[PDB]
Structures are given as structure tokens and as C-alpha cells.
Design a protein around this ligand. Structure first.
Ligand SMILES: Nc1ncnc2c1ncn2[C@@H]1O[C@H](COP(=O)(O)O)[C@@H](OP(=O)(O)O)[C@H]1O
Ligand SMILES: CC(C)(c1cc(Br)c(O)c(Br)c1)c1cc(Br)c(O)c(Br)c1
Ligand code: NA
Length: 292
């Protein structure tokens, strides 16, 4: 029944488990036409996509908050592979969008449409420690339609460890993007670094995007993109979406916004099981995360 639930909700594409609604029209994603000045923001789900997106949007608008609030974020920054028959269509949104385009995606590098690589588009990749991602993704399953019942948190974590969740293995995702992140066109960031020193990462982002980093611009970005501001901003907190698709009464999208909430969810036994498995998955990579 749980396995049956997963079967009804998700289907594989290129070996990667995916929301079934997306897969039906995957040819649209496959043949997507990039432009050289497109910017890709790529993340494993729940790694702070919304956070870095708004920072990037502010950098584009030279810190003009009104310009950022002119439309909701999922319209300002289309979700590339996302498709709900005719109700939502990321590819369509991008096709009609005036450049310069900012593109959101959760795809592993092997699944990113070839055109982005061919045109050598800049990519910003953001990752977050796996435990915190797992917690966040768990509540996401609960709040959002199109997910199976995730069961108990230990049950969900078992699926997470095996990569049996939308977008597949977090382990492979981050490891693959880490290799790409050696390219000068790909900026590799950590959620935990944005928490620890937001100013340093914002400045890093400004330089990567070839803009000028003034104190005033940097200050505007920092407070506009802080958790408390974004939580209350209807342009960025997804509250304009109805409850029957995103039910924020169960759990808000802007949920806690901290590093270390895994300490509030993993039991000692689950933590031990998770840590052992994690080491085996990640031993052969120089990528290093902080869980606090
Ligand atoms: N301005 C901000 N500062 C810190 N965390 C933020 C943030 N905006 C969104 N997040 C967090 O990023 C996660 C959502 O990620 P995504 O945008 O990729 O779906 C949520 O994590 P939590 O559920 O742990 O609170 C959310 O709270
Ligand atoms: C596919 C999903 C669940 C989603 C949204 C975001 Br934001 C994500 O980052 C990831 Br991952 C998945 C979604 C939810 C609603 Br409600 C929708 O109306 C549509 Br169209 C798609
Ligand atoms: Na790089």
C-alpha cells in the first residue's frame, strides 16, 4: 500500500525517480532551448532553492525590492521541468520569458537539458547536509499534494537513503554536481555557509554574476532575503498557492530555516544507521558537509 502509493505517484526517467506529472511531457524538457545568458539555479529539493533564488533575483534587479515583489517567485523564476498538464508549465514559462532568464531546476547534471551545457550557461548549485534535507523533504511530502504518505520519519529516511524519492539519490546528486562545480561556469554553494556568513556568500554571488558589490546593495539583499522577511513575503512563501495543492496549515513552506533540525527528528538508532550508510556513500569524494 505504501509501495503502491509510491508506484502511483512516481515514475523513473533516465533512471531517476520523478513526479509522474513531469515525466509525461519529458520530451519538452529534453529538447529545451537555452540562451547563452540563461542562469541555472540547481539544487536537490529542500536545500534552500527559494533562498538563493531570491538573492539572485535581487542581484539582477540591483536590489530593487519592488521589482522583486511584482510577481510570485515561481513566476519570476520558472521551475524548468515542472508540469501539470496545462495548469503549470515551466518550459512554456521560460519560452515566453524575456531574457535574461533565471531557471530553477532540481535535476542531476546528467539530466540537465543539453542546450544549457552546449551554450555554456552559468550554473549556481546549492546543497545542504543530507539529514536536514531529509527532515525538510519529509514535511514537504506531508504538506504537498502529489506525494504518497511518507509514513513515519524512520520509514521516510529509509527511502531517502535508497534514493527512492523524487530526484533520486541525494548522495549521487551532490557528488555529481561537485564534479561539475570544478568548472569555472558552475558555482558550488552550501546552505550552511549561507547561514554562517550570509555577507560572504552574497558578495561571492555578486562577483560570480559580474555585478558590482556595494555596501548598500549587499545590505539590501541581506535583510530582504533573511528567513523572517521571506517567511512573511507572499511573493516568496508560496502562500498564494491554495491549501489543496500546498497545505501550509499542516506545515509552512518557510518552516524553520535553521541548520541542525535533524537533531530534533533522528533517534539515536536512526542516526547511527544513517551515519554508517552515509560514510559508505560519501567516502570516495572530497565534498565535505557540516551538520552543525
Ligand atoms: N531566507 C531563508 N533563510 C534560511 N532558510 C530558508 C530561507 N528560505 C527558505 N529556507 C529553507 O529552505 C528550505 C526549503 O528549500 P527549497 O526552497 O529548496 O524548497 C526550508 O527549510 P526547512 O524546511 O528546514 O525550514 C526553508 O525553510
Ligand atoms: C512538484 C511539486 C510537488 C513541487 C513544487 C516545488 Br516548489 C518543488 O521544489 C518541488 Br521538488 C516539487 C509541485 C507542487 C505544487 Br502545490 C504544484 O502546484 C506544482 Br505545478 C508542483
Ligand atoms: Na566552479
Amino acid at each position: 500500500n505504501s509501495e503502491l502509493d509510491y508506484y502511483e505517484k512516481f515514475e523513473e526517467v533516465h533512471g531517476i525517480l520523478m513526479y509522474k506529472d513531469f515525466v509525461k511531457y519529458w520530451d519538452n524538457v529534453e529538447a529545451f532551448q537555452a540562451r547563452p545568458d540563461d542562469l541555472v539555479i540547481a539544487t536537490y529539493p529542500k536545500s534552500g532553492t527559494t533562498w538563493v533564488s531570491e538573492i539572485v533575483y535581487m542581484i539582477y534587479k540591483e536590489g530593487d525590492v519592488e521589482k522583486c515583489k511584482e510577481d510570485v517567485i515561481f513566476n519570476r523564476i520558472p521551475f524548468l521541468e515542472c508540469r501539470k498538464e496545462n495548469l503549470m508549465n515551466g518550459v512554456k514559462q521560460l519560452d515566453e520569458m524575456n531574457s535574461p532568464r533565471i531557471v530553477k531546476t532540481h535535476l542531476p547534471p546528467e539530466l540537465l537539458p543539453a542546450s544549457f551545457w552546449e551554450k555554456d550557461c552559468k550554473i549556481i548549485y546549492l546543497c545542504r547536509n543530507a539529514k536536514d534535507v531529509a527532515v525538510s523533504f519529509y514535511y514537504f511530502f506531508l504538506m504537498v499534494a502529489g506525494h504518497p504518505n511518507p509514513g513515519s520519519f524512520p520509514e521516510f529516511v529509509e527511502k531517502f537513503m535508497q534514493g527512492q524519492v523524487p530526484y533520486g539519490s541525494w548522495y549521487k546528486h551532490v557528488k555529481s554536481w561537485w564534479e561539475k562545480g570544478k568548472s569555472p561556469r558552475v558555482l558550488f554553494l552550501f546552505y550552511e555557509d549561507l547561514k554562517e556568513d550570509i555577507r560572504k556568500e552574497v558578495i561571492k554571488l555578486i562577483h560570480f554574476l559580474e555585478r558590482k558589490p556595494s555596501e548598500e546593495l549587499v545590505d539590501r539583499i541581506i535583510h530582504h532575503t533573511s528567513f523572517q522577511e521571506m517567511k512573511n513575503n507572499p511573493s516568496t512563501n508560496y502562500t498564494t498557492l491554495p491549501d489543496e495543492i500546498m497545505n501550509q496549515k499542516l506545515s509552512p513552506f518557510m518552516r524553520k530555516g535553521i541548520t541542525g533540525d535533524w537533531k530534533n527528528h533522528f533517534t539515536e538508532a536512526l542516526n547511527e544507521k544513517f551515519d554508517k550508510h552515509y560514510e559508505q556513500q560519501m567516502k570516495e569524494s572530497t565534498l565535505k558537509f557540516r551538520t552543525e
